């Protein structure tokens, strides 16, 4: 069962974060209401001294306030935050942070970003090759609606297939066809139509000498 999602962050390790489209108007409503409260009771720069593991608000590059978690307190000027509804990370001074009211906690609305990885693909070990694959996915799917299916679990996050929402084309397969990633083979019957296939796409890419396959 493919589920509609909005892709918000692609990581340098070729993982990505998504929001569930079904809960998106609720996120927008919570953000509306949270920022209403912030405009009425403006955070004083430096009045919040953060601690590791706390939820807070943080002012992003667009000048808007978002929900965040404090991951590391390096110094008062260098607080490492994770934007819990989007999945991106940032180092900020405490002057761009404020307290998160209980009205807007993760108990009122859970963190909206969930981490996933592509099923049936190996993340390239070479940094430059990995960068090419990451850059391609960012251009392909960042800030777009996709359809997601969970394929299997892993030692880390779940591994999934993604389809472009309009065209229904398989995102991960497109990376394989472009020679940006290698196939990670799965044996299971339920995966056979998809895998043997991904392996035939890897052949298209090996023949066109694309990206990973440029030199044989």
């Amino acid at each position: 069962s493919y589920k509609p999602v909005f892709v918000t962050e692609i990581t340098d390790d070729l993982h990505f974060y998504v929001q569930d489209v079904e809960t998106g108007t609720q996120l927008e409503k919570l953000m509306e209401n949270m920022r209403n409260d912030i405009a009425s009771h403006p955070p004083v720069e430096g009045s919040y001294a953060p601690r590791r593991g706390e939820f807070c608000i943080a002012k992003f590059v667009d000048g808007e306030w978002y929900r965040a978690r404090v991951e590391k307190v390096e110094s008062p000027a260098k607080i490492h935050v994770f934007y819990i509804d989007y999945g991106n990370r940032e180092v900020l001074p405490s002057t761009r942070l404020g307290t998160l009211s209980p009205a807007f906690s993760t108990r009122v609305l859970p963190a909206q970003a969930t981490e996933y990885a592509f099923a049936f693909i190996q993340v390239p070990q070479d940094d430059d090759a990995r960068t090419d694959a990451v850059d391609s996915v960012v251009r392909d799917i960042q800030n777009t609606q996709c359809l997601l299916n969970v394929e299997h679990l892993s030692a880390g996050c779940p591994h999934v297939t993604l389809q472009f929402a309009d065209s229904k084309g398989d995102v991960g397969l497109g990376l394989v066809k472009e020679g940006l990633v290698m196939v990670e083979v799965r044996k299971e019957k339920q995966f056979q139509k998809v895998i043997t296939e991904y392996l035939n796409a890897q052949e298209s890419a090996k023949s066109a000498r694309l990206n990973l396959w440029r030199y044989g």
Binding site: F60, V61, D62, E64, N143
Partner: peptide
């Protein structure tokens, strides 16, 4: 949708 961005943000920027």
């Amino acid at each position: 949708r961005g943000r920027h």
